Every structure is written in structure tokens, then in C-alpha cells.
Amino acid sequence: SHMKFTIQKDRLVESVQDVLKAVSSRTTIPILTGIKIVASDDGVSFTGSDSDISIESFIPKEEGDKEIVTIEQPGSIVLQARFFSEIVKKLPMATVEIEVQNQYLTIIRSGKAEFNLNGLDADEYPHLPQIEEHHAIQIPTDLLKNLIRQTVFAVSTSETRPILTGVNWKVEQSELLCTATDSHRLALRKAKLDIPEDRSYNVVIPGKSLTELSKILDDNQELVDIVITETQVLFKAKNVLFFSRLLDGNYPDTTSLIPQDSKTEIIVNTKEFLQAIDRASLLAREGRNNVVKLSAKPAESIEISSNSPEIGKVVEAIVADQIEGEELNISFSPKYMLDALKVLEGAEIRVSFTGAMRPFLIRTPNDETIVQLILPVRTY
Amino acid sequence: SHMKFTIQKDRLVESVQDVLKAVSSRTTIPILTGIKIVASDDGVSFTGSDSDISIESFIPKEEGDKEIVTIEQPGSIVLQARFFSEIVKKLPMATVEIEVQNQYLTIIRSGKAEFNLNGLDADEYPHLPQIEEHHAIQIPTDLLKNLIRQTVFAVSTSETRPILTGVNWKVEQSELLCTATDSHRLALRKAKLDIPEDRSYNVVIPGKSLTELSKILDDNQELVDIVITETQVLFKAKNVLFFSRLLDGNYPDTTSLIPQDSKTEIIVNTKEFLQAIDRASLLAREGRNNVVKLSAKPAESIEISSNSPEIGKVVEAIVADQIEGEELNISFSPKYMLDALKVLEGAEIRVSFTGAMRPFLIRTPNDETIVQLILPVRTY
Ligand code: NA
Known part of the structure; x- marks a missing residue:
């Protein structure tokens, strides 16, 4: 033969x-x-x-x-x-x-x-x-590709905790919830499935x-x-x-991590916000944590800033569509913010904060199917 | 301020x-x-x-x-x-x-x-x-870009003989001659200039x-x-x-590298020849030098080949437009041959050999303004 x-x-x-x-x-x-x-x-x-x-x-x-x-x-x-x-x-x-x-x-x-x-x-x-x-x-196929694109970037790249290098796929009551996290940021996508409501799965895919x-x-x-x-x-x-x-093991429970209420809510043009965060990230130096600061106060004022000692600094004002709630001064990784904004598809985003030290959420207005979460950088 | x-x-x-x-x-x-x-x-x-x-x-x-x-x-x-x-x-x-x-x-x-x-x-x-x-x-500008394209790839990347890391530009009687070599292969490019005939230059540009x-x-x-x-x-x-x-110093005279007489002359379609040598180069094993063989005899067909022990081999026939002179079996670096063929613009090339041990030339038929010379691989 x-x-x-x-x-x-x-x-x-x-x-x-x-x-x-x-x-x-x-x-x-x-x-x-x-x-x-x-x-x-x-x-x-x-x-x-x-x-x-x-x-x-x-x-x-x-x-x-x-x-x-x-x-x-x-x-x-x-x-x-x-x-x-x-x-x-x-x-x-x-x-x-x-x-x-x-x-x-x-x-x-x-x-x-x-x-x-x-x-x-x-x-x-x-x-x-x-x-x-x-x-x-x-x-x-198109929904599958989008589910992957909206979650896979948030997995850990470290093999320290292997389970976090995969995306958790949880199926219950004919709904798929895909969660990815690296303990610093998290992506969640929900999708309705056409399967019997009694079917249940909870797996982690690399x-x-x-x-x-x-x-x-x-x-x-x-x-x-x-x-x-x-x-x-x-x-x-x-x-x-x-x-x-x-991947073998129990994926961690992240449902407690997603806040259900907020203290400050911003609605802002997505492209405008992304472009400003991208500019604020440009003076990053190796061997130094690049952090960006966001200040917000009703009704429409946002200030984005960053500084790199001995290199320079940047400040930029952005006019929001809406700002409601408490005045906020918060810092975070621009890489995580840019990674989240890249997968959101609307003209605007909704950013939901609970002060400067708790995780904040990035979502598309009127869309409950995708949630991006970022842990801020604590300042002293 | x-x-x-x-x-x-x-x-x-x-x-x-x-x-x-x-x-x-x-x-x-x-x-x-x-x-x-x-x-x-x-x-x-x-x-x-x-x-x-x-x-x-x-x-x-x-x-x-x-x-x-x-x-x-x-x-x-x-x-x-x-x-x-x-x-x-x-x-x-x-x-x-x-x-x-x-x-x-x-x-x-x-x-x-x-x-x-x-x-x-x-x-x-x-x-x-x-x-x-x-x-x-x-x-x-276009002629300048082309003369750089057709020469700079042949300079040496070694610092043992620094003058060879530059292209010799010799201007005499309203014509520019560019020479580049690394001791293994050589590129010669001539261009007519619209300048007074008494102007003379001889320099080496990195x-x-x-x-x-x-x-x-x-x-x-x-x-x-x-x-x-x-x-x-x-x-x-x-x-x-x-x-x-x-670059400072005297650029070496390379006229003697060209054999005074050729023993075998081939005229072949540039694209077909380039594509066959590219196929013959695909079974390279690191860190062994890739070697391709060309066998030519008058009245057809050119045979391109290569052998990679434990991997495979390849053999390809090419119909030449013309083959004159001695039967020839010669080996060479496909990297040098492909670098040379990629800068020739004619539908055909003339390849002139003087046995298996001496340098061979690649030219466009009825033209001496672009000359590519390669030393073959010595076999024992
Ligand atoms: Na330009």
C-alpha cells in the first residue's frame, strides 16, 4: 500500500x-x-x-x-x-x-x-x-470568532497559574458565559445558545x-x-x-468581582477616549510602570494625564457625553484600557467606577452581552 | 524661553x-x-x-x-x-x-x-x-534608487576589511561605475551621467x-x-x-576576477531560472551552507538540483533558449544566485561559466551595464 x-x-x-x-x-x-x-x-x-x-x-x-x-x-x-x-x-x-x-x-x-x-x-x-x-x-462561525476576539486577549500569559491561561466557557440554562482574566483585568462575553436548558458545562479552553x-x-x-x-x-x-x-482544575469565581452598582458613570465617544488614552501612553519607559490618570467631574469634564520623569508629561481634556455621580481621580494601565476599548464596537462607551481603588467596568451603552473590567493602580 | x-x-x-x-x-x-x-x-x-x-x-x-x-x-x-x-x-x-x-x-x-x-x-x-x-x-531619482538596489546587497557585512562594506563609486568620462563585493560575489553597475567629461571621482560609500x-x-x-x-x-x-x-582607503581592483574567456554560455528565461533555484534552495538544514548544483549540456535541458541528506532532494529541468560550449556541472550558493537574479530586469539572462572552479557571470543579453559575478562552491 x-x-x-x-x-x-x-x-x-x-x-x-x-x-x-x-x-x-x-x-x-x-x-x-x-x-x-x-x-x-x-x-x-x-x-x-x-x-x-x-x-x-x-x-x-x-x-x-x-x-x-x-x-x-x-x-x-x-x-x-x-x-x-x-x-x-x-x-x-x-x-x-x-x-x-x-x-x-x-x-x-x-x-x-x-x-x-x-x-x-x-x-x-x-x-x-x-x-x-x-x-x-x-x-x-462569525459569532464564535467574535466571542474569541472579545475575550482571549485577557488571559494570562504566565504559566505560574495555568488555569488563567485559558478562557472559561460556562454553559447553563442555554446561555454561554466566556470569562478570561489575568488577575489584573477581565473580559466577559455572554451568548444565548440553542440547546436544551438542562445541559451544563464548565470548562477552560487554552x-x-x-x-x-x-x-x-x-x-x-x-x-x-x-x-x-x-x-x-x-x-x-x-x-x-x-x-x-x-485545562484541568476549577476556574476561579469572578462573579463577586463584577460590581453591580457604581458611584460615577461616564458616557464618552469611544474613538475620542481611545485616542486620548493612546496619547497618554506615549511617554512610557522600560523599567518603569506606565500609569495614566483620569479625573472626572459632572457634568462633562474629563482630564487624562501621565508623567515620565526626565522624559516629559502629557495632559488632555476630553468633553464627555454624560458624567453622573461622584468626582473621581483614578489611575490605571493604559495597555489594559486600550485592549478593552479595541474589542468594544459602539460609537460610545459607558465607564462605571466605584472610587479609585475598586475595579471599574467598561461597557457599550444598552448592551448587557460584553463586560470589560480593569483593576486600577493604587496611588499614595 | x-x-x-x-x-x-x-x-x-x-x-x-x-x-x-x-x-x-x-x-x-x-x-x-x-x-x-x-x-x-x-x-x-x-x-x-x-x-x-x-x-x-x-x-x-x-x-x-x-x-x-x-x-x-x-x-x-x-x-x-x-x-x-x-x-x-x-x-x-x-x-x-x-x-x-x-x-x-x-x-x-x-x-x-x-x-x-x-x-x-x-x-x-x-x-x-x-x-x-x-x-x-x-x-x-529612479536611476539612483535602481543603481543602489542593484549593488548594495553585495557589500561585505564583515568588519575585517572595512572598505568592502561600501560601494565603490568611480566617475570618469561622464559615466558612473558602481562596484560592490564581499569576496564571494560581486555587483557591477554602469550608468551614463549628463555631466562634463573632465569630472573625475573615486570614493567608497557605506x-x-x-x-x-x-x-x-x-x-x-x-x-x-x-x-x-x-x-x-x-x-x-x-x-x-x-x-x-x-570610507578611507584604496578599493581593490576586481577586473582580474572576471575570467578572460568563458567555456559554457547559457541564455535562459530569468523568472523560470529564479523560480527553479528558489525551489532548489528549500531543503536547507541549519547550520549547513545551502548548495545548489547546475548541470548544462548543449541541445537541452538544464538540470538544477540539491540534496539534503536525511531530508530529501530536488531536481528540476529548465528549457534554455540557448546553450553553447562545454558540458558543465557547477555548484553554488543559492543565496548569492537569488540575490543576483532578483536585481535583473530583463526577460532573459546570459550566464557565462569557465568550468566549475572559476567565477561565473550573470548579465542581460546584449548589455554590459549590469554585471553580477559569483564564485562557485569548491567540491573535492
Ligand atoms: Na516623503
Whole structure:
């Protein structure tokens, strides 16, 4: 059984680049530096994995009304991922021939170019996670991508507390609550699901897994099937399977952290506020905490400021739409503020404070589905 | 107190971004991390330098009907370049006010945003070379950019022989000859100049200087004035002065590297040849030198190949337009070959060889104005 097929370059390249995201250079299992190719009577699959994530991309032999693959001999092989990827991108013709010969030597031909790669026995490649493909949650691709974008940036990048490097996905009463935090700032996104109200899940998905999944999903409204087990999550979309290992442990309870009342409320043009916070962040120095100060007082006055000794300082006034409540002087990280503002989509934002030392909230007016929280910097 | 003016943001940002190319983060002359600003009754100049390269950009107060600058008080200041550049790009309004006050503390205001920077006395800033009145040679901007593109990549990056880190510019009988080499490969570029025939120059310009110069030159054919002295070269373009220190010493004679006679001559499609050598370079293994082999015999076909033990191999046939002379098997660095082929603009190239051990030449057929020479890889 020596694998042999002819395929369209464009589709081959697309599948290889999708699975390449699951291949890590640093790997304790040597065969995981390869891509597994399996040609069957129905088409060809490509698999890449790093043990944490696995990506399987399938190319059907025929799609629409065009012949994409011609399989002369079904079979399988493992090829080194980086070399295979670099080769396929540069093949000269629209048609590519892939043929395994003896001792796993694999021929890749296109036009007058012929590559030979030292293949490996695909029976040595690890099997995909075996999961009961049941109780799938369905989410439109565009909503899934936005859920990820509005939360994943807030996970910790430290492996000190691994559970905080993932996004908590909690499903109860047909509602999904996605929470990400690094103990300094927090992002929460809520979404209604079309599932039985009795279904319950509480898992933590690595932020890296969700960022890579979003890179392989297109901007469309097709339903993604999500199967959650005790230790894995499977995302199925058209011609693709994306598996991720879940992080073990109990995610911390952050519901007490989100304030339900406020002392000061600001409504301000989003772009105006973002541009001013961005300007206030420009005199940041390495080996020094860059902090920005916000002063607010009814009815419409905001002063943004920062100082960097021996470099300079900045002050800027902004006119708010509305300011209600107590006068406030608060300091915070401009990076966290800018990260939150970047994921909010409205013309204006609502910022809700409870004095200078408690967490504050950033939201879109009249939208209860997204909440950004930032812990301020204590000043003395 | 001192310098004070109002300027258009767009022109301020353009000038700052041009001079920032001469500012080094690793300078050992502290004031050279700054940008010198000088406001006079005619306009404002901006200068950046690393002691080898200096760039001065000028903004006239008026251009026809539009007022670009309003100078309330002439004067000068030095501001930290990186901070200044980051600030000016983000100012909120089309108009910017810059005002030096006491202790060199400088205000940068636009709309309701006010920055203060710790300025430095501009009298400590080094002076530029005073060479604007010596004889100039003129070159269209596009031709100048192309002659840099077609030569600077071949200079040495090693400091063992510093003269080889620059491009030799030899002017004689109204023609410019540019030579660059690193002892492994060589680029030769000839350009006709519209200057008196008795003008003579022979200097070596640092490769880094020409790379930075090209970044500030636009895609047009306006004449650039070039003033060459013993230790400095000045390039003058619209509102910009670019100075470079020249390298001291005698540039080596490279005429003898070219074999007097060729034994094999190939004429091939540039793009097909470049694409095949690029494919042959893909199985490189770190830290081994990438080697590609070319086999040529009259009456077709050129064979490009490479072998990477334990990874794979590649073989590609190319149909040459013409092959004359001896059968040849030669090996070379694909990096040098691709660098050379990427600067040739003809649909075809002529490749001339004198066996496997001597240098080979790459030229456009029926033209000697661009000559690329590469030493092959010695095999035993
Ligand atoms: Na420009």
C-alpha cells in the first residue's frame, strides 16, 4: 500500500497551512514534526498535532462540479511539516502529484520540478482523540470568532497559574458565559445558545487554542459544531476538525468581582477616549510602570494625564457625553484600557467606577452581552 | 524661553519620519538620540544623525498659496527623537504648536492635547558638513534608487576589511561605475551621467548609508544633486539633505576576477531560472551552507538540483533558449544566485561559466551595464 494521488495545488496549500498551526518546532514526540496525509476513495486528509491541539483538514475528491483530487492508490504517509509546507507553496503548476515509493521515500511533482522527501510510517502517528460526537453545541462561525476576539486577549500569559491561561466557557440554562482574566483585568462575553436548558458545562479552553482556531475559520455564518467532553473540546466546521485539550482544575469565581452598582458613570465617544488614552501612553519607559490618570467631574469634564520623569508629561481634556455621580481621580494601565476599548464596537462607551481603588467596568451603552473590567493602580 | 511656531501636522510627521532614519538607538554621543529643530524666518529644519549619516529635512513657511508654518519666534531645540516621532504621529488636529519655554522644557500642543518634553540645548548638536557649493553631479531619482538596489546587497557585512562594506563609486568620462563585493560575489553597475567629461571621482560609500538614502527617495525622476568631497558625500533632493561619511582607503581592483574567456554560455528565461533555484534552495538544514548544483549540456535541458541528506532532494529541468560550449556541472550558493537574479530586469539572462572552479557571470543579453559575478562552491 503505497499512497499515490494528483491534487490541485491551491487546495493542497490551503489544507497544509491550516494544519501547520498545530505543528510545534519544540516537540518531545519526534513524529509530531510531521504532517500525516491519508488518501482514501473519498478524498485526502491532512493532520497536524502538538498533543494539545490537533487539526485535521479534508479535501474531497470532487467539490461543486470540479474534480479536485484523483486518487490512484489509497494510502498514508507522514512528511516533515515545515519542508512540505515550504515546497507546496512554490510548486510551478496548478496540478501536483504525490507518490510514496519504497522505504517511505515520497515524490512530490509539479511541472518539471520533482522533490523527494524522506517519509515516515503513518501507523506511528498518534490517533486523534476519541470523543463521543454527541450533545454538540452549534454556534455561527462569525459569532464564535467574535466571542474569541472579545475575550482571549485577557488571559494570562504566565504559566505560574495555568488555569488563567485559558478562557472559561460556562454553559447553563442555554446561555454561554466566556470569562478570561489575568488577575489584573477581565473580559466577559455572554451568548444565548440553542440547546436544551438542562445541559451544563464548565470548562477552560487554552487561549492559544482559540486564537489558532479563529485563524482557520472563515468570515461566514455557517454553524460550527462544538463537542465538549471532560478533557477535550472538538470544533467541527466545513472540511475541518479542530481538537483542543482542556485545562484541568476549577476556574476561579469572578462573579463577586463584577460590581453591580457604581458611584460615577461616564458616557464618552469611544474613538475620542481611545485616542486620548493612546496619547497618554506615549511617554512610557522600560523599567518603569506606565500609569495614566483620569479625573472626572459632572457634568462633562474629563482630564487624562501621565508623567515620565526626565522624559516629559502629557495632559488632555476630553468633553464627555454624560458624567453622573461622584468626582473621581483614578489611575490605571493604559495597555489594559486600550485592549478593552479595541474589542468594544459602539460609537460610545459607558465607564462605571466605584472610587479609585475598586475595579471599574467598561461597557457599550444598552448592551448587557460584553463586560470589560480593569483593576486600577493604587496611588499614595 | 525661545523657539515658537505653528505647523501643519502632515508635513511635520513627514519630516520627522525622514530624519528618524539617521537616528541610532545605540549611539555613544548622547545628544544624537535627539532631533534638532531650527526655526528661522524662512521655515523650520529638522536634523537627525548617527555621526556617519546625517539627514536634514526643511519645511518652508510657504508653498504657493498654502501657509505650512507660522514662526512666532525663531530659535532651536533638541528633542528626543523616538518620543517626538511617536507624539507627532498621534496629535489630534491638523495644526501643531511647538513652544520652547525656560529650562528647555518644550510644549507640543494640538487641539486640547498638550505634551511637555525635556529639551536639550541645540548648540551642543554637532554641525553638518559645509559642502553645498562644490561641483555637483546629477542623477534622476529612479536611476539612483535602481543603481543602489542593484549593488548594495553585495557589500561585505564583515568588519575585517572595512572598505568592502561600501560601494565603490568611480566617475570618469561622464559615466558612473558602481562596484560592490564581499569576496564571494560581486555587483557591477554602469550608468551614463549628463555631466562634463573632465569630472573625475573615486570614493567608497557605506552600504548602510545608501540603503537609508533610498528609503527617503520617492518613485519619481527628479534630479538628485550629488556633491562628492574627500570625506563626505551629500545627496540633495527637494527639501532634503542627506550626508554620508565616505570610507578611507584604496578599493581593490576586481577586473582580474572576471575570467578572460568563458567555456559554457547559457541564455535562459530569468523568472523560470529564479523560480527553479528558489525551489532548489528549500531543503536547507541549519547550520549547513545551502548548495545548489547546475548541470548544462548543449541541445537541452538544464538540470538544477540539491540534496539534503536525511531530508530529501530536488531536481528540476529548465528549457534554455540557448546553450553553447562545454558540458558543465557547477555548484553554488543559492543565496548569492537569488540575490543576483532578483536585481535583473530583463526577460532573459546570459550566464557565462569557465568550468566549475572559476567565477561565473550573470548579465542581460546584449548589455554590459549590469554585471553580477559569483564564485562557485569548491567540491573535492
Ligand atoms: Na516623503
